[PDB]
Symmetry: D2
Subunit: 509 residues, 4 copies
């Protein structure tokens, strides 16, 4: 009954996976908690089992990790970068089998599964050069015979909690950056993607062991809300990087703040695209489609609100409807599929709930809006017109392929409509007007962390810092100087002169 | 009865202060809240009165601030820098009279009063150049025909809450930086330093008005915990910079996180000095004294813990005793004075409580430990030996001149003792060992935000970021790239080619 | 002398007399040849200045290097405080100094005052900069080691400036080099000696008020002999030269000969390009002001105008009508937009270029003649019909002569902008999103200044200022230009107790 | 007779080397110039032959390179970095055979041969991350509705001339950085290491070709002074990176300055180590030896001057004499060997010439000073005492293992003795005094580009910029913001508002 026991899935063994796998690594493999079975979202068939972490499993892991840091922190950063470089190569060796696993356990199409592995590979090679660059400036002191310097040091243990939609890349961003910065990591992934977590951990573990380093440098404790809450309340966790829903992310933020710890929050998005009258419709229409239905609309940066100028509204919508009909559905591991299933059945139930509510709030389903009659968690990509921009269902984030479409007249009101929501991740405008673009990038423009022009809301790369504002959390990952979130700044004044302070009337010696 | 009504204090009128003053500014002056009277800690006599902000006063002020931002944000940063330059000049014009007010209402000596105003002047002149520099890099995209840029924009309204011990400089740091970054400010200082807040606002108000700008750019709402709490819960406050107690700062952080706002926290410190066997004792003894009794031990960065190696412990303790006996107390606005009074009568009572508790936990008072019999809130600078490093009173932050002295043996254990407290503001070592210094600055060294060598825990300047770790809050002010806390980062991809997607 | 007349009594407020000392190194002097400067508006003598002899130069150089011994030990933020006070001293005299600029050089009053403001702004900028300069602490690959990047002053910075900007260029170099901990030696244009003296007088007071040796900002007024000496002098650690390309070439060669540092800000042949989709309401006035500004004597003055064929004739006509409205007159008089050329010699160079353009096949559509009036006034001139590769068009002439060209496609007009030897400033007027990024990219303009919808004189203090190719490559004012005034050292510090591998050898 | 025709050297074929090899690559292999034979300095036996570039070979290559740039410059910088990354892997795959070629043809011991290849591998991996980082800041404009940004673009063609002592790493530094910065390269290595030049190019040739890129991006033209001079005079070479002797570098610098081009100069050094009384002699003695005799004392960063405090001089020298006697000499491709031959027989004649000149000037040889009786170019590592610090031979850079030893009394004078030479590459002090250390790194300390503490003069790594001052040339390579030397800066102002310029009285 298990998929891994079938001959057509023998490639899973290339990742070191078995019928039942250990979900805890801290130098040694284990797991005394509940055994979980993960399923294929494309056909609802069981893949394999993973033994999750118990409470005691977690305690020993944190302790060994903090013990491993004593060794890891003494290693020069460029030498820490060389370790990450080897991690990048090891991922290259398994890029096809691991990407296939992502498509199998998570549900995204094959080219995106492999692409997600490639993101980890790229940020590794990026982290290598960065490992020779991290540091602060030498500042000129106002005091004669004194030096003023800014030092950066690791915070220690970096706890990493990731979500289902990107079960490889998000960890990879945090991991590669935290490692070169001299920290040790503890990983708790989404329970429904444990096999991927185990597979990635297995690749890194070997690299650490071959270099005679303690494996606890990149620890793993598979588990649910119990393990996650524990990490947020644990003073031994110096930084908790959390990626997930806003409702959970809010509670994560409060618990860490209660113990004066550090948090890095990457939460929900309600991303909008704006098309003006002077926009290239040949560019606009497909950009809208791919950003709205991409990964079955389960990206953090998925387009969920589409604002179109009155002059071109009906045309764009109709041209979108004809295009939606040409979207090829099917199993995610097939070389012609563009659209796979949703990750859970609950997501299907939430998809329907938002649809029923959208019609109740006065919206009209112009395409899709129904579950597909087929095995797996398949729903139709959906377009909804007629809603007010301030509709409740429209300001609510649903992790499903539902695109709310609105009309607007002037630039001023449509910039405000983009900013009126609680989320603040990504945003895009399509136009050619030079002045409008610079306004969009200015203080009266978009309030999001990602502000794009003539490219959809998923436009982002390794070179820049990734994250959002407001209810998205304010956290940043990967590029720019985001590494500073994984280190602590100290401002240091050094007296090297033999000069003594003014006596101020006091007789010493 | 009011000091301001007395001829010997007529200099107060040079700052525009009257018998009763308005504690609210948002373009107009007002205050429908409680009338508060502030006292001089040197003689316990009332100085003047201030009408605080009502609930309606606060609500109206926020609205005018967010309206003022619409104009302020459209102004180019270097031109915002020009205003900041003018603010610096207006402070120069009142530096001596304003500094005297600091000594009168707060209690610190004159040279520190004038000195605190100078810090505001210096951060202004710094911010001028900084206004032509703030921004992000142009990065090379992996995509052909695309541009990748990092943009920085103002966060909007910056709420600023300050404490009594530094009632001018802390606001100045936040104000000067936030202004050039295109934000508007709303200030709530300590109730017992309301006159200082009013006087400072008066100087800035003049600058804004002469330049035909809305006064709400730098608003003032005098009040207590109710105003502070309202700001912490107000969604219209995009960034709240709080300086104060660890206990109160903790709740502020929770309230701000609850509504997904931004906070900048500058809380308590339990700063330590470490003297090794190879240290220059001619340098150590005065460094400790000035860092321990400075401002009657009411600085955030005041030295409260002194670790000395066994070989030189008794000698250093003795040499501190002889130097402590020469410390001149008296009126803070008086020359040759090095040591002023405590801020409140309550602080004197807490000083005694810390003294009695130190004796109960097994400590020995080798100097001081008593109240001085004189008008005002004067106490003796105190030295305590014999406590264990893990003593309860030693991990407790008391805003009074009490120096706890400890012995240590090895480098490893004394570094840990420096880091074992909940606070993480400032720290210092005195030594000549090259390796020891770099370990101190390294990952197995100090966990504080300010890590000094051969200079006491009050060693810091404008050019660098000021702040601490752990229970100190993690926030930073003034130098380096601390300005990023007052702005929002955006990562921007611009497609300019004619290529269509696959 | 104009200074002996009551209507110019304001000149005495700058401390200027009938005859002035042209050497300052803590003490004032000058044993060289006496030079007399004239007002280009009426060819009347203003005052005299005694220039530096050879011995004057030697004593000045020696005293400057002694002053550096003190100056370098002063903390950078405290050096910034000195620069800040220099800024305030300039504010107090901004109106009279700007008036002197108009009198002695010839540019209009609003630009004269503005140039003083340029010195003032860069001062206030350098103040914050004095708390920021430095390098990174880098992570060493070696355990127990530190890797740091240090910056230190180069020592003595010689500064050579030109006539057209006798205040701002020196000011740029002064404020930056000072906060970097260097001492300066200034040789200005001989025809703007009074301005050099007036500026030196203001700063000297500031240094004296702060009890600093005056040689930190030294002055040695002189001609080619002083310039030649500075270029060959090993005691001159960095030489900043602003002037003609032909002389700048020889200056660079002399400095390279002795392995010194040079900062060259030389000539430009700057072009504006207007495409069909450009806002003609923006193009026409922008073009005029950039072409006729300061009588076309700026380094960044527009000398080449490329217009798209479809709108060429219209733009030319609208420029002809606009040129007719240019108000000429005395530079120290309000509503005046156009003053005289700096020298009478320049007028002869103006006429020579006009006749040579017509000989090469050009057509004068406006101006091209001398004005019958006192001073060095010439008509602002427009020339059409020349080929883009015309000899007169590739030559930098310091006169108000605008060469107009037609083009068809983007590719060729980008190349025509880059085909000249000069590479200072450049501008395009367009709205096409793609064309702008190509203009800013590797296949676009090769200049140091690359503008969009703004004329060739578009620049500000926050950014680095300078050009490429035959312009010299030097940068001034903004960005990380300060690195040109300091020396980089890469420093590895061993603080561990570890000994190197013996590799089989027995020590101790 | 050829070593490559002998079976014991068959590993050379793993690098694609044959009996006679092509010394020109620009997409195709060729070479119509003079045929050169390279020899092994360990036994003076011929290895293989190389056909050098003729003039016609040079012209065609430059043309193809500049045409190849049109494609290379349009490729995104991170995509150029991906190319540099593969180049690193190709070097990794051949590190042992290539390192052996370095030891065979140049003469350094095997662990250093491999080490030099490893440095090229490391700068590739560094440059990968750097390719996503290069660029300038977006500055806040003072002008409303305007944007201010600093752009960086490639300079075009990067000519690279290298020397014998580091025939792999020096090119590698320049190649990797210039490539990600969007430039194309033209390489002319030392004639005596032509095989190394060919072998490296072949490794790169495969990488470019496998990615369907024009091979001229990393071109090769093997040749001597005739090829080198042309590169210095060719206006089509936008940046010339030259590593070599001070005497030649000066002439290269002048020729490049003559045509207003860019130069990057990495020239000679006369590097000094200083030992103070409080220094750890257990650290000093091995540091001095390894820094003085390493690579047979033929590094640019070789310790050539040793300053020791009066109190500890005789002890340090005596301890050095005993350690020098333990230096194991022999063939470079054998383990436990620390000292190989000099690169040429001419270097042997100049090694001896310096020894004889030291005795004539009053020096005493306390160790070595004679030729070794064996095949190849082997000489004894030499120590010289008793010389004045201003001895002519001490100020002369000799590429041989000769250490001149001096005594000093006070800190001030020995700092001055460090700075008195024309060269300005590397320098080191050994001490524990905190104040002395900060003075040494400060404005009154060393004037060199590399300033180390308690680590010898060869202490440097990739993360930081590498280069020297004064007569060393001023150029920088590898780390920090050294990449700026391979690109041109532009300061760009963009008006995006609808605002029109002030009319100033004119009606449009």
């Amino acid at each position: 009954t298990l998929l891994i026991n079938q001959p057509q899935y023998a490639w899973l063994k290339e990742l070191g996976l078995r019928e039942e796998n250990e979900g805890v690594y801290n130098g040694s493999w284990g797991g005394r908690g509940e055994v979980i079975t993960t399923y294929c979202p494309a056909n609802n068939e069981p893949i394999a089992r993973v033994r999750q972490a118990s409470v005691a499993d977690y305690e020993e892991t944190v302790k060994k990790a903090r013990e491993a840091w004593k060794i890891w922190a003494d290693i020069p950063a460029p030498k820490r970068g060389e370790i990450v470089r080897q991690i990048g190569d090891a991922l290259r060796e398994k890029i096809q089998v691991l990407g296939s696993l992502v498509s199998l356990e998570m549900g995204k199409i094959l080219v995106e599964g492999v692409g997600e592995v490639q993101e980890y590979v790229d940020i590794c090679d990026y982290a290598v050069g960065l490992s020779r660059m991290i540091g602060g400036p030498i500042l000129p002191s106002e005091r004669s015979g004194h030096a003023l310097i800014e030092q950066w040091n690791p915070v220690g243990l970096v706890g990493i909690i990731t979500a289902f939609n990107f079960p490889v890349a998000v960890y990879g961003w945090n991991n590669a950056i935290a490692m070169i910065c001299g920290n040790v990591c503890l990983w708790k992934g989404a329970p429904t993607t444990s096999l991927i977590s185990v597979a990635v951990t297995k690749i890194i573990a070997k690299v650490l062991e071959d270099n005679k380093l303690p494996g606890a440098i990149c620890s793993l404790t598979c588990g649910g809300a119990d393990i996650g809450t524990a990490m947020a309340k644990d003073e031994r966790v110096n930084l908790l990087s959390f990626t997930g829903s806003t409702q959970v992310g809010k509670q994560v933020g409060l618990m860490v703040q209660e113990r004066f710890g550090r948090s890095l929050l990457e939460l929900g998005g309600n991303n909008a695209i704006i098309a003006f009258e002077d926009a290239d419709l040949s560019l606009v229409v497909p950009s809208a489609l791919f950003a709205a239905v991409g990964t079955a609309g389960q990206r953090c940066t998925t387009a969920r609100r589409l604002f179109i100028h009155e002059s071109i509204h009906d045309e764009v919508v109709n041209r979108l409807k004809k295009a939606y009909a040409q979207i090829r559905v099917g199993n995610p591991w097939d070389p012609n599929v563009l659209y796979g299933p949703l990750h859970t059945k609950q997501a299907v139930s939430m998809f329907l709930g938002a649809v029923e509510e959208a019609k109740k709030e006065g919206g009209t389903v112009v395409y899709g809006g129904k579950v597909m009659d087929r095995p797996g968690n398949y729903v139709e990509p959906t377009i909804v017109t007629g809603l007010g921009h301030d509709a409740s269902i429209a300001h609510t984030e649903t992790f499903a392929p539902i695109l709310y479409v609105f009309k607007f007249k002037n630039e001023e009101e449509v910039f405000a409509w983009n900013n009126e929501v609680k989320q603040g991740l990504s945003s895009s405008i399509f136009t050619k007007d030079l002045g409008r673009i610079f306004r969009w990038l200015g203080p009266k423009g978009s309030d999001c962390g990602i502000v794009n022009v003539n490219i959809p809301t998923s436009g982002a790369e390794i070179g820049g810092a990734f994250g959002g504002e407001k209810h998205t959390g304010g956290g940043r990952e990967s590029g720019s100087d985001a590494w500073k979130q994984y280190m602590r700044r100290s401002t240091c004044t050094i007296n090297y002169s033999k000069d003594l302070p003014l006596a101020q009337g006091i007789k010493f010696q």
